[PDB]
Design an enzyme around this catalytic site. Structure first.
Site, mmCIF file in Angstrom:
data_model
loop_
_atom_site.group_PDB
_atom_site.id
_atom_site.type_symbol
_atom_site.label_atom_id
_atom_site.label_comp_id
_atom_site.label_asym_id
_atom_site.label_seq_id
_atom_site.Cartn_x
_atom_site.Cartn_y
_atom_site.Cartn_z
ATOM 1 N N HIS A 10 0.834 -1.191 0.000
ATOM 2 C CA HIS A 10 0.000 0.000 0.000
ATOM 3 C C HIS A 10 0.876 1.251 0.000
ATOM 4 C CE1 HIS A 10 -2.104 -3.521 1.630
ATOM 5 N NE2 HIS A 10 -3.115 -3.136 0.851
HETATM 6 S S1 FES Z 1 1.528 -0.745 3.378
HETATM 7 FE FE1 FES Z 1 -0.491 -1.659 3.586
HETATM 8 S S2 FES Z 1 0.303 -3.618 4.269
HETATM 9 FE FE2 FES Z 1 2.165 -2.478 4.644
#
Ligand code: FES
Ligand SMILES: CCCCCCCCCCCCCCCCCC(=O)OC[C@H](COP(=O)([O-])OCC(O)COP(=O)([O-])OC[C@@H](COC(=O)CCCCCCCCCCCCCCCCC)OC(=O)CCCCCCCCCCCCCCCCC)OC(=O)CCCCCCCCCCCCCCCCC
Ligand SMILES: CCCCCCCCCCCCCCCCCC(=O)OC[C@H](COP(=O)([O-])OCC[N+](C)(C)C)OC(=O)CCCCCCCCCCCCCCCCC
Ligand SMILES: CCCCCCCCCCCCCCCCCC(=O)OC[C@H](COP(=O)([O-])OCC[N+](C)(C)C)OC(=O)CCCCCCCCCCCCCCCCC
Ligand SMILES: CCCCCCCCCCCCCCCCCCCC(=O)O[C@H](COC(=O)CCCCCCCCCCCCCC)COP(=O)(O)OCCN
Ligand SMILES: CCCCCCCCCCCCCCCCCCCC(=O)O[C@H](COC(=O)CCCCCCCCCCCCCC)COP(=O)(O)OCCN
Ligand code: HEC
Ligand code: HEM
Ligand code: HEM
Ligand code: HEM
Ligand SMILES: CCCCCCCCCCCCO[C@@H]1O[C@H](CO)[C@@H](O[C@H]2O[C@H](CO)[C@@H](O)[C@H](O)[C@H]2O)[C@H](O)[C@H]1O
Ligand SMILES: CCCCCCCCCCCCO[C@@H]1O[C@H](CO)[C@@H](O[C@H]2O[C@H](CO)[C@@H](O)[C@H](O)[C@H]2O)[C@H](O)[C@H]1O
Lengths: 244, 85, 54, 71, 111, 383, 61, 124, 110
Positions: free
Chosen positions: E77
Site C-alpha cells: 500500500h
Molecule cells: S503498506 Fe499496507 S500492508 Fe504495509
C-alpha cells in the site's frame, strides 16, 4: 502504480492450444522439452514432472526410460545401513540443478530461479508471459533506467530488473527434427512445453468439455420443451367471472 | 397465514369458472415466435430505464476515475500526484 | 405408430428399459464419434500423429 | 535468422512510427540531461520507460499474429 | 546491511546501522510522527536495529533500503518506514514493532 | 389416505418438495434457491472427495493439491469443480439475496427466514475463506495473515484471540490443520441453517413477484416447479462446464499457485472476487477497528430491512422510485466490488468512501424516506 | 362473459390430432430423450467421478 | 407503516393548497408509471395482508367486494405468470380505482390504537 | 417397526464408523484390522478383489487408504446423527413404549 512497476503486459499470441477444440502441438512440446533440458535446466527445476509424464506426450516409453536410467537417485540403505545410489526409473521425478535454496541463490547472484512446473499458471499471462519475457530483453535498457547490480532490463518483468539474463540466442539448441532454432522458435516451444507442464490434463479436459457441452445443450433444449409442455395447462387457463 | 390443500386460507371464492386444456391437447409452442419477438420487446422496453440509468452512471464514474488514476501515474501527472498525496 | 407406443412406451417398465438401452447405445457411439472428430480437428498435433517417428 | 527482428523493425518504421519518434526524442532529452553536470544531485531523474512501453505495446499489437504464423 | 531472520514465521530485520544512519534517525522531531518515539526508545544498542519486519498496516513485509525516508518500503500500500523503522508516509498506523531481544553476548542476541 | 401423506417420514418430504403449495406465478428468480441447493450438494460431493486426497500438514498441503491435479484420476476435474462452484455459490447467493430485497421477501411474515438467511450468508463467507487457506499457496497464506490480524483490533483481548485461533504466533501448520477440520465441518452447519430457514418459511410460504397473497391460487411444487428448476439446472451446468472445462482458472488468482512463503509478500493481496465489496468497505474507514466494524455492519445491516422499509406494499414490482433506488444500490455494490481490487491510490480512495456512504445510506436514510413517500403517492394518486 | 357452458376460445392452442397415438408418442419421445441423456450423463458423471478412488498414477507406478 | 399514518399525512398534504398543487400531479404520474392498473388491480389490492389487523379488515369486507377482490387477484396472478398485460375491460380505469378497503382497515386500526393508548392511562 | 428398522441401520453405521476410526491411528492393529476386514470383501464373487483394490486405493493398505478413511470417518458420524434423528421422528407417531407394554395414552407426563 507506474506501468514500470506493473510490467508491460504481454501480447496475445495465437497459441495452437488456444481454442475450445484445440490440443497442444505435441511436436512443439517435444522440441520445448529439448530447450528446457539444454538451457533452462541449468538453473531451473521441474520438480513436479516425473519421467513417466513424458511418455505418450513427448517421448516413447523407451526414450523416457533411457533418460531416467542415465541419472543416479538415492536408494534404500544397504544391509550394513550404508547409503546407496540406483539408476532412475520412470516413477522418478526429474531432478533439479541445486540441492537447496541457498545453493541456488549462491549460483545466481542472490536471485532464486523458481521451479517451472507451475510457472505458466503462476503468472498473469501464462504462455504469453513466458514467451514475452524470454524474447523481450532489449539490447540496451531505455535511457534513464538504473539497474541494480546483477539485474538485467526486461520490460515484461514487474519493476524492470530481472535476475535472469537473456539466455536464448539463435542456435543454442540444435533441434533433432531439423526445425531452425531461432530465438523466437525456441521461446515458442519452451513456452508451450511449460504450459503443458503446468496443466497436463489440458487435452483430455477440453475433449470431455466438448462432450459435456453437447449433452448439456441437448438436455437444456429438451428441458425447455418439457417445461413448456407440462406448464401449458397453467399458461392456457381462462376464467369467466360472474359476481355472486 | 398459509394453510394446506382444502384450507389454504383464501377468502371464500364464488363465481369464478376456470377452464383449461390437457398438455397433450395443446401446442406447447403456440405463438412462441410472436412472443419471443413482440412480447420480449414490450417487456424489455418497459424496464430499460431502470437498468440503463444506474449502469450508465456508475460506468461513467468508473471510467472517469480509472482514467484519472492512469494519468496521475504518468510523467505528465507527476505534479498532480504530488498534491494528491 | 400405435404399435410403437404399445410396445415401448405404454408400460413404464418397458419405457425405462428402452431409455436405458438407448442410453447405453448413445454412450458407446457418442464416445466413438467424438473421438474421431477430435482427432480430425487436431490432425498432426497429437502424440498419435507423431509417434510413428519413434 | 530470427523472424522477430525483421517484423519488429518493419512495425517500428510503419504503423508505430509516431511512437518510435516519441521514444527517440525522449532518449535524446535524457542522454543530454545525463551529460550535463549536477545531474546526480537532481531531485527528478527522467527515464524513457513510458515511451518505451508505448512503442513496445504498439509493436506487439502489430506483430504477434505475423510472428506466430512463421514458426 | 540488514538481515532477515525468521522468528516465529514473522521476518526479523536486523540492520547494522552506520554512524550517519543513526544521525539521520535522531533528527526527526518526535512531535511530527504518527507513532511518536525516538530511536533510543526503539533500540537498546544504537548499532543494532532489531525489528519485526511486518508492516503495521495489514501485515506485508517491507522491502528494506527502499522508501522515501530510506529505511523500509511496504510495496502493498506504499508505506514508508525510517532508519529507526518509524512510520513516515502511507497507510500504516504504527512504527515497526520491536521484539523482546537481549544481548547475551556482544556478538549474539536472543529474540 | 395416500402413503406419502400417511407415513410421517414421507410426509415431511411430501410437504416440502411435492405437495408443497406454491404461488402459480413465481418467475425465474425463484430458481436460485434450488441452484444454491445444487451448489451445496456439488460442494459436499467434491469437497469430501478432495478430503480423501488432501493432506492438512503445512509441509504437504500444497503438494497434495498438486497430487490431486496431476495423479488422481479426474482429480483436475474435482479440484476445479470445487473451486469454481464456490464462485457460482456466491453468484447464486447474491442473486437470491437480490431477489429477496427487490421483492420484499424480508417483510412480515417472513422476517425469520430472512434473518436466518443472513446468518447462512455469514457462514458461507467463513466456509469459503477457510477453504481458500487450505491450498497453502501465497494467496492462502497472505489472506489468512491479513484477515486474522483484523481480529487484533478487538480491544484488550484481540491479540490473544488471534494467537489462539492460529494456534501459534503466525499462520503456519497449526492454523492449516484447524482450518481443514473447520472447513470440513462448516458446510454441514450451513446445511442445517439452510434447512432451518426453509422450515421457518413454511409457515408463510413463498412470496411471489406481485407481492400479493397467493392463497387464492396455488400450484403443487411438483411437477410444475420441478420441471422449471431443471431449466435453470441445465443453464447453470452449461456455465459450470464453460468454466470448469474451458477456462478453469479465469475466476482465480495465479498467486495461489506459488507455495506460501512467509518472507516474500505477493505483488497484491486481494481476496476472492465475491468478498471484494466488503473489502472495499473496510478500506474506506481509516481506523482499523472502525473498518472491521463497518465491514461486519455491512452484512448485519441487512437485519434491519424489516424495520426501515416502511412501505404498505410488499416488493418493488409496482414502485418506480424504489426500483430506481434499488438499481443504484445494486450498481454501487458492484462498484464497491471493483474498488476492492484497485490499488489504494487517488482518486479511488475518496470514491471508495463515497460508495461506502451510499451503501449504508440506502438502509438508513433513502429506503425509509422513499418508502414513506411512495405510500403517500399511492394513496393520493389513486383518490 | 356470463354463460359458463360457453367454453372460452382455445382454438389458438388446440391440436387437431390430439387423441392419436402419434400425438402422445411424440411427447414421450421428448421425455424419453431427456431421460436417455440424463441416464447417459449420470453414468458418465458417476464413472468419471468415482474413478478418482481407483489407484492414482503415482501408486500405479 | 400503518394505513392510519399514510391517510393522516395525505390529508395534511391535500389541505395545504401549495402542497397539493405540487404533490397531486406527481402522485397521479407515479400511479400511471406504477402500472398496477395494467394488471387489473385496484390500489388497495396491493396492501400487505399478512398482519392480524389486515386479516380482520378483510373479514369485514361486504361479501360482493370480497368475491370481486378474489377474482382480481386470481386474474392478475394469471397475467403475471403469462407475462401478459390486461387489455380492454380488464385494465383498471382511474374511476374504478376505489378505496374499498381503506375504511375497514382504518376502523380496525383505530380500535387497536385506542386500545394501546388506554392500556397506558394514568388516573390523575 | 419403522423406528426399529432405522435403528438397525444406525447400528451398522456405528460399526463402520468405529472401524474406520480405529484405522486412523495407523498402529499395528489399525493396519492389520484394515487388511483383514477389507479382504472379507474379496469373498464377494467375481468383483470382490476389484472392489477391495478400489476401496484401498491401491494394492495394499497404505496412504490412500488412510486418507480416505479419515475423510469417511469424519463424515459418517454426521450421517449417523441424521439417522438417529429419523428414528426419533418415526417414533413420534406412536410415542415411547413403556415397561408394561400397555397404552400410555391414558396417563402421560411432559
Ligand atoms: S503498506 Fe499496507 S500492508 Fe504495509
Ligand atoms: C447463474 C446461473 C445460471 C442460471 C440461470 C438463471 C437466470 C435466470 C433469471 O432469473 O433471469 C432470467 C430472467 C427471466 O425471468 P422471467 O421469469 O422471464 O421474468 C422475470 C421478470 O419478471 C422479467 O421482467 P419483465 O417481465 O419486466 O421483463 C424484463 C426483461 C425481459 O425478460 C425476459 O424475458 C428476458 O428485460 C429486462 O429487464 C432487460 C433490461 C433492459 C436492458 C436493455 O430475465 C430477466 O428478468 C432479466 C432482467 C433482470 C435485470
Ligand atoms: C443492474 C440493476 C438492476 C435493477 C433492476 C430493476 C428492475 C428491472 O428492470 O428488472 C427487471 C425485472 C422486473 O420484474 P418485475 O417483477 O418488477 O416486473 C414484472 C412485470 N410487471 C411489472 C408487469 C409485473 O426485475 C427483476 O426480475 C429483478 C430481480 C433482482 C436481482 C438483482 C441481483 C443483484 C445482486 C446484489 C446483491 C446484494
Ligand atoms: C439422475 C439420473 C436420471 C436417469 C433417468 C433414467 C431413466 C428414467 C426416465 O427417463 O424416466 C422416465 C419415466 C417415465 O416418465 P413418465 O412417468 O412421464 O411416463 C409415464 C407414462 N408412460 C409409462 C406411458 C410413459 O419416469 C420415471 O419412471 C421416474 C424415474 C425418474 C428418476
Ligand atoms: C459432481 C459434479 C456434477 C457436475 C456434472 C457436470 C459434468 C461432469 C461429467 C464428467 C464428464 O466429463 O463427463 C463427460 C460427459 O458429460 C456429460 O454427459 C455429463 C453432463 C450431464 C449432466 C448431468 C446429468 C446427471 C449428472 C448427476 C448425477 C450423479 C449422481 C446420480 C446417480 C465426458 O465424460 P465421458 O463421456 O468420457 O465419460 C465416460 C462414459 N463414456
Ligand atoms: C440433474 C439431472 C436431472 C434429472 C432428470 C430426470 C429425468 C426426467 C424425465 C422423466 C420424467 O419426465 O418423468 C417424471 C420424473 O420427473 C421427476 O419426478 C423429477 C422432476 C424433475 C426433477 C428435478 C427437480 C428439481 C431439480 C432442481 C434441483 C433441486 C436442488 C437440489 C440439488 C415423472 O413425474 P411426472 O409427475 O411428470 O410424471 C407424469 C406421469 N407419471
Ligand atoms: C543461468 C540462469 C538461468 C537460465 C539459463 C534461465 N533462467 Fe529463468 N531465471 C533465473 C533466475 C535467477 C530467475 C529469478 C529472476 C528474478 O526473480 O529476478 C529466473 C526467472 C525465470 C522466470 C520467472 C520470472 C518471474 O516472473 O518471476 C521464468 C518464467 C523463467 N526464469 C524461465 C526460464 C526459461 C524458460 C529459461 C530457458 C529456456 C530460463 N528461465 C533460463 C535464472 C535462469
Ligand atoms: C445455502 C444457501 C441457501 C439455500 C440453499 C437457500 C434455499 C432457499 C430455497 C430453496 C428457498 C425457497 C425457494 C426460493 O425462493 O428460491 C429459499 C427462500 C428464501 N431464502 Fe434462501 N437459501 C439460501 C440462502 C439464503 C440467504 C443467504 C438468504 C437471505 C439473506 C435467504 C433468504 C431466503 C428468503 C427470505 C426466502 C423466502 C423468499 C420467498 O420465497 O419469498 N436464503 N431459500
Ligand atoms: C459450502 C461448501 C463449500 C465451499 C463454499 C467450499 C469452498 C472452498 C474453496 C473456496 C476452496 C479453495 C479452492 C481452491 O482454490 O483450490 C476449497 C478447498 C477445499 N475444500 Fe471446500 N468448500 C466447501 C465444502 C467443502 C467440504 C464439505 C469439504 C469436505 C471436506 C471441503 C473440502 C475442501 C478441501 C479438501 C479443499 C482443499 C483442496 C483444494 O483447494 O481444492 N470443502 N473449498
Ligand atoms: C445414535 C444411536 C441412537 C440414539 C442416539 C438413539 C436415541 C434414542 C432415543 C433418544 C430414543 C427415545 C428415548 C428412549 O427410549 O431411550 C430412542 C428410542 C428408540 N430407539 Fe434409539 N437411539 C439410537 C440407536 C438405536 C438403535 C441402534 C436402535 C435399534 C436397533 C434404536 C431403536 C430405538 C427404538 C425401537 C426406540 C423406541 C423404543 C421405545 O421407546 O419403546 N435406536 N432412541
Ligand atoms: C427440502 C428437502 C426435503 C426433505 C423435507 C425437509 C425436512 C423438513 C421437514 C421437517 C419439518 C417438519 O415439517 C412440517 O411437517 C408437517 C408434515 O410433514 C407439515 O404439515 C403440513 O402438511 C400436512 C400434510 O402434508 C398437513 O397435515 C398440515 O396441515 C400442513 O401444515 C408442516 O407444514 C411442516 O412444517
Ligand atoms: C453403483 C455404480 C456402479 C459402480 C461405479 C463404477 C465406478 C468406476 C468404474 C469405471 C472407472 C474406471 O473405468 C475407466 O473409466 C475411465 C474414465 O471414467 C475410462 O478412461 C477413458 O476415458 C478417459 C476420459 O473419459 C481417458 O482419460 C482415458 O484415457 C480413457 O481410457 C476407462 O475406459 C474406464 O476403464
Amino acid at each position: 502504480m507506474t506501468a514500470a512497476e506493473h510490467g508491460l503486459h504481454p501480447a496475445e499470441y495465437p497459441w495452437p492450444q488456444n481454442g475450445m477444440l484445440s490440443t497442444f502441438d505435441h511436436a512443439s512440446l517435444r522440441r520445448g522439452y529439448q530447450v528446457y533440458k539444454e538451457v533452462c535446466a541449468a538453473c531451473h527445476s521441474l520438480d513436479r514432472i516425473a519421467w513417466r509424464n513424458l511418455v505418450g506426450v513427448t517421448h516413447t516409453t523407451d526414450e523416457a526410460k533411457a533418460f531416467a536410467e542415465e541419472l543416479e537417485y538415492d536408494d534404500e540403505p544397504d544391509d550394513e545401513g550404508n547409503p546407496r545410489k540406483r539408476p532412475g526409473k520412470l516413477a522418478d521425478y526429474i531432478p533439479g540443478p541445486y540441492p537447496n535454496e541457498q545453493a541456488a541463490r549462491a549460483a545466481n547472484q542472490g536471485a532464486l530461479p523458481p521451479d517451472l512446473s507451475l510457472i505458466a499458471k503462476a503468472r498473469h499471462g501464462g504462455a504469453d508471459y513466458i514467451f514475452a519475457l524470454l524474447t523481450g530483453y532489449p539490447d540496451e535498457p531505455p535511457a534513464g533506467v538504473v539497474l541494480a547490480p546483477g539485474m538485467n532490463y526486461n520490460p515484461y518483468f514487474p519493476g524492470g530488473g530481472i535476475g535472469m539474463a537473456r539466455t536464448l540466442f539463435d542456435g543454442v539448441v540444435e533441434y533433432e527434427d531439423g526445425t531452425p532454432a531461432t530465438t523466437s522458435q525456441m521461446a515458442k516451444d519452451v513456452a508451450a512445453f511449460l504450459t503443458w507442464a503446468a496443466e497436463p490434463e489440458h487435452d483430455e479436459r477440453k475433449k470431455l468439455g466438448l462432450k459435456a457441452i453437447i449433452v448439456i445443450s441437448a438436455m437444456l433444449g429438451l428441458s425447455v420443451y418439457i417445461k413448456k409442455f407440462k406448464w401449458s395447462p397453467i399458461k392456457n387457463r381462462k376464467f369467466i367471472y360472474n359476481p355472486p | 397465514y398459509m394453510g394446506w390443500w382444502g384450507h389454504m386460507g383464501s377468502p371464500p371464492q364464488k363465481g369464478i369458472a376456470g377452464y383449461t386444456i390437457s398438455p397433450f391437447a395443446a401446442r406447447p409452442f403456440a405463438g412462441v415466435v410472436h412472443a419471443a419477438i413482440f412480447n420480449t420487446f414490450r417487456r424489455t422496453k418497459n424496464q430499460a430505464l431502470f437498468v440503463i440509468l444506474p449502469v450508465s452512471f456508475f460506468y461513467y464514474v468508473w471510467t472517469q476515475a480509472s482514467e484519472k488514476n492512469e494519468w496521475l501515474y504518468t510523467k505528465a501527472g507527476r505534479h498532480e500526484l504530488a498534491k494528491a498525496l | 405408430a400405435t404399435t410403437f407406443y404399445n410396445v415401448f412406451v405404454k408400460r413404464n417398465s418397458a419405457f425405462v428399459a428402452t431409455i436405458l438401452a438407448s442410453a447405453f447405445v448413445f454412450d458407446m457411439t457418442f464416445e466413438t464419434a467424438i473421438d474421431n472428430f477430435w482427432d480430425r480437428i487436431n490432425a498432426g498435433k497429437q502424440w498419435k500423429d507423431i509417434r510413428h517417428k519413434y | 535468422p530470427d523472424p522477430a527482428i525483421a517484423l519488429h523493425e518493419a512495425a517500428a518504421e510503419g504503423p508505430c512510427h509516431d511512437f518510435k519518434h516519441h521514444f527517440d526524442e525522449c532518449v535524446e532529452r535524457v542522454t543530454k540531461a545525463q551529460e550535463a553536470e549536477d545531474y546526480d544531485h537532481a531531485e527528478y531523474k527522467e527515464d524513457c520507460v513510458e515511451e518505451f512501453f508505448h512503442l513496445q505495446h504498439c509493436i506487439n499489437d502489430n506483430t504477434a499474429d505475423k510472428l506466430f504464423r512463421v514458426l | 546491511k540488514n538481515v532477515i531472520i525468521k522468528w516465529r514465521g514473522k521476518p526479523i530485520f536486523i540492520r547494522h546501522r552506520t554512524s550517519e544512519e543513526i544521525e539521520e534517525a535522531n533528527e526527526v522531531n518526535v512531535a511530527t510522527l504518527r507513532d511518536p518515539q525516538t530511536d533510543d526508545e526503539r533500540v537498546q544498542k544504537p548499532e543494532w536495529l532489531v525489528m519485526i519486519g511486518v508492516c503495521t498496516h495489514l501485515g506485508c513485509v517491507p522491502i528494506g533500503e527502499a522508501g522515501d525516508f530510506g529505511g523500509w518500503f511496504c510495496p502493498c500500500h506504499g508505506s514508508h518506514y525510517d532508519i529507526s523503522g518509524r512510520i513516515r508516509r502511507g497507510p500504516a498506523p504504527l512504527n515497526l514493532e520491536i521484539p523482546e531481544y537481549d544481548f547475551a553476548d556482544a556478538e549474539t542476541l536472543v529474540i | 389416505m395416500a402413503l406419502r401423506k400417511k407415513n410421517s417420514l414421507l410426509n415431511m418430504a411430501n410437504s416440502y418438495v411435492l405437495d408443497s403449495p406454491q404461488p402459480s406465478n413465481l418467475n425465474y428468480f425463484w430458481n436460485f434457491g434450488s441452484l444454491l441447493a445444487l451448489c451445496l450438494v456439488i460442494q459436499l460431493a467434491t469437497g469430501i472427495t478432495l478430503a480423501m486426497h488432501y493432506t492438512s500438514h503445512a509441509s504437504l498441503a500444497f503438494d497434495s493439491v498438486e497430487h490431486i491435479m496431476r495423479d488422481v484420476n479426474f482429480g483436475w476435474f474435482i479440484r476445479y469443480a470445487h473451486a469454481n462452484t464456490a464462485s457460482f455459490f456466491f453468484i447464486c447467493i447474491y442473486a437470491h439475496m437480490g431477489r429477496n430485497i427487490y421483492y420484499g421477501s424480508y417483510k412480515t411474515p417472513r422476517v425469520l427466514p430472512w434473518s436466518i438467511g443472513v446468518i447462512i450468508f455469514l457462514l458461507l463467507i467463513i466456509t469459503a475463506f477457510m477453504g481458500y487457506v487450505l491450498v497453502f499457496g501465497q494467496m492462502s497464506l497472505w489472506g489468512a495473515t491479513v484477515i486474522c490480524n483484523l481480529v487484533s483490533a478487538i480491544p484488550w483481548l484481540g491479540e490473544d484471540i488471534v494467537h489462539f485461533l492460529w494456534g501459534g504466533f503466525s499462520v503456519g501448520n497449526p492454523t492449516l490443520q484447524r482450518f481443514f477440520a473447520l472447513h470440513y465441518l462448516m458446510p454441514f452447519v450451513l446445511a442445517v441453517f439452510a434447512l432451518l430457514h426453509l422450515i421457518a418459511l413454511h409457515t408463510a410460504g413463498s412470496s411471489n413477484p406481485l407481492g400479493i397473497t397467493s392463497n387464492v391460487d396455488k400450484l403443487s411444487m411438483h411437477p410444475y416447479y420441478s420441471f422449471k428448476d431443471l431449466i435453470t439446472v441445465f443453464a447453470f451446468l452449461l456455465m459450470f462446464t464453460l468454466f470448469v472445462f474451458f477456462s478453469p482458472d479465469k475466476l482465480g488468482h495465479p498467486d495461489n499457485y506459488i507455495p506460501a512463503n512467509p518472507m516474500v509478500t505477493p505483488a497484491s493481496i486481494v481476496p476472492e472476487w465475491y468478498l471484494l465489496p466488503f473489502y472495499a468497505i473496510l478500506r474506506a474507514i481509516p481506523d482499523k477497528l472502525g473498518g472491521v466494524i463497518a465491514m461486519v455492519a455491512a452484512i448485519l445491516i441487512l437485519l434491519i430491512l424489516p424495520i426501515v422499509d416502511r412501505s404498505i406494499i410488499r416488493g418493488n414490482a409496482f414502485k418506480p422510485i424504489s426500483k430506481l433506488l434499488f438499481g443504484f444500490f445494486i450498481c454501487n455494490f458492484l462498484l464497491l466490488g471493483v474498488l476492492g481490487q484497485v490499488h489504494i491510490e487517488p482518486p479511488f480512495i475518496v470514491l471508495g468512501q463515497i460508495c461506502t456512504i451510499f451503501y449504508f445510506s440506502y438502509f438508513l436514510i433513502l429506503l425509509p424516506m422513499v418508502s414513506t413517500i411512495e405510500n403517500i403517492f399511492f394513496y393520493i394518486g389513486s383518490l | 362473459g356470463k354463460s359458463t357452458y360457453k367454453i372460452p376460445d382455445f382454438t389458438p392452442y388446440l391440436k387437431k390430432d390430439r387423441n392419436t397415438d402419434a400425438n402422445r408418442l411424440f411427447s414421450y419421445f421428448m421425455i424419453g430423450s431427456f431421460g436417455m441423456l440424463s441416464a447417459a450423463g449420470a453414468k458418465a458423471t458417476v464413472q468419471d467421478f468415482l474413478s478418482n478412488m481407483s489407484a492414482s498414477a503415482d501408486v500405479l507406478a | 407503516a400503518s394505513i392510519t399514518s399514510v391517510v393522516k399525512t395525505s390529508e395534511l398534504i391535500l389541505k395545504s393548497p401549495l402542497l397539493s398543487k405540487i404533490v397531486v400531479p406527481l402522485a397521479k404520474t407515479y400511479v400511471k408509471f406504477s402500472g398496477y392498473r395494467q394488471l387489473g388491480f385496484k390500489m388497495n389490492d396491493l396492501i400487505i395482508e399478512e398482519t392480524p389487523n389486515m386479516q380482520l379488515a378483510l373479514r369485514r369486507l361486504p361479501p360482493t367486494e370480497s368475491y370481486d377482490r378474489v377474482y382480481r387477484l386470481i386474474r392478475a396472478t394469471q397475467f403475471s405468470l403469462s407475462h401478459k398485460l390486461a387489455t380492454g375491460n380488464d385494465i383498471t380505469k382511474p374511476e374504478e380505482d376505489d378505496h374499498y378497503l381503506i375504511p375497514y382497515i382504518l376502523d380496525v386500526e383505530a380500535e387497536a390504537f385506542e386500545k394501546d393508548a388506554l392500556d397506558n392511562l394514568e388516573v390523575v
